[PDB]
Design a protein around this ligand. Sequence first.
Ligand SMILES: Nc1nc2c(ncn2[C@@H]2O[C@H](COP(=O)(O)OP(=O)(O)O)[C@@H](O)[C@H]2O)c(=O)[nH]1
Ligand SMILES: [Mg+2]
Lengths: 175, 322
Amino acid sequence: SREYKLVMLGAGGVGKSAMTMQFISHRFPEDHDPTIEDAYKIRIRIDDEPANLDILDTAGQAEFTAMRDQYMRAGEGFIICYSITDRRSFHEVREFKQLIYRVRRTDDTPVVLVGNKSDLKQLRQVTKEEGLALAREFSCPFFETSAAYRYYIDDVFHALVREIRRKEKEAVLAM
Amino acid sequence: GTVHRWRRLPPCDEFVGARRSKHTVVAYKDAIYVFGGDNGKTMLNDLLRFDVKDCSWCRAFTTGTPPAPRYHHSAVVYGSSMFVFGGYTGDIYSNSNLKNKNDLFEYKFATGQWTEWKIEGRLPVARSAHGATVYSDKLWIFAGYDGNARLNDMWTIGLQDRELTCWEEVAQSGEIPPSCCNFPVAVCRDKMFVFSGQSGAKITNNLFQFEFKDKTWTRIPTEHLLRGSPPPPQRRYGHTMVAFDRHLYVFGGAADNTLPNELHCYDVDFQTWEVVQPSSDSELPSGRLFHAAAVISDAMYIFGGTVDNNIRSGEMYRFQFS
Ligand SMILES: Nc1nc2c(ncn2[C@@H]2O[C@H](COP(=O)(O)OP(=O)(O)O)[C@@H](O)[C@H]2O)c(=O)[nH]1
Ligand SMILES: [Mg+2]
């Protein structure tokens, strides 16, 4: 069946693992080892159509493992994540978007931009409007999510699959 | 020369071969042979020869169709031949035609002949970053990444007569290591050893032995805490491991977003780890990953690997065994 391989991109500590777990098992991780990178699966029905998702929670900065290398090259969609309480992570967003170009040799690869930890309204260092501006600059959907309370978690991955199915169908029309 | 001396040998010239990572090195006679890898721009399928006694590089003479350019493949030596299996193939520059492989190529050192062993019947799944070794006249393939998930199956194939050989999947027993990739394999006595490696959520610094005769895996426990023995090396991937005398030597790799350069030694007979202290006049190598190692007589040889910041290396380091 249709297997969608997605990649969780983002600086260390933005909450990539917390967002993944919530999406695949409706749980918040207690003490998650940040140096752990693995892939996780789930079958959800977006727009009344079942879809198999294979999501890689990335970690580490050395040369990619064989799993990561093939994921960055064959993955159909990317989720670039930052923390709204971490302006440094909000700046690395562009470096990840550049990284996608270096591998894919194109900027049309489906992407969704996510600013995590929206519940931390007290320590907010990145405004919501900025994330929208960066998303329109990237021509990609934008969500402010909270992995702690599962706010808009499903909407992020739902959107990316829509981007994939949209871009796949636009190719068929040309051919 | 000196015992435990990290000697820095002349690196590979650019007009001979590009500095690369994720390649394979194999020892034959008294020469190191380098095949495949990644220079940072494209995949490679050339063959280099480094005469150990002469300390000179050279592009090896190859006739016939070589394997498609690849990295994360395996390479072993059986008799007077090098056997390449698996790996990733494609076009990095355009991110196209990318696919894993399960083919088997033989390089006759004597004549420089590249021959493909077109094996009939059921094949192992095309994979990369797998472990490989030669024992009892058979090539052993283990684990790796097939393109959808990490693996932990094991396959063998006889290397005596290509006309009559075929692939056989191993019914493994014991504590099979979890699905792993980018791990080293070193055979010692009648047992195969695997240490650490990228296994996803189950990444550990565990040591596994595989007894070929009963096809059983055993995770060697460490009592270092109780007997005040040196702890095992930090968990890592993309590292090498060779066997000399009754000892395993682990070096390199990426350990939790770091590239340590310590030389770790495992006493298989006394189930203890060590950190070998190099000599005073040692030319210590830098922390690298996705390099490759080989042993000629009483010496270990390291070549290539990503040193840092995605810089590919072409340095030849030599460690003298006690
Ligand atoms: N309050 C809150 N904390 C979060 C959220 N996401 C992550 N965290 C915390 O931030 C830390 C880093 O999370 P982690 O998923 O390991 O970051 P990663 O390295 O990108 O995977 C953890 O201690 C989490 O408890 C969130 O949405 N809300
Ligand atoms: Mg994480």
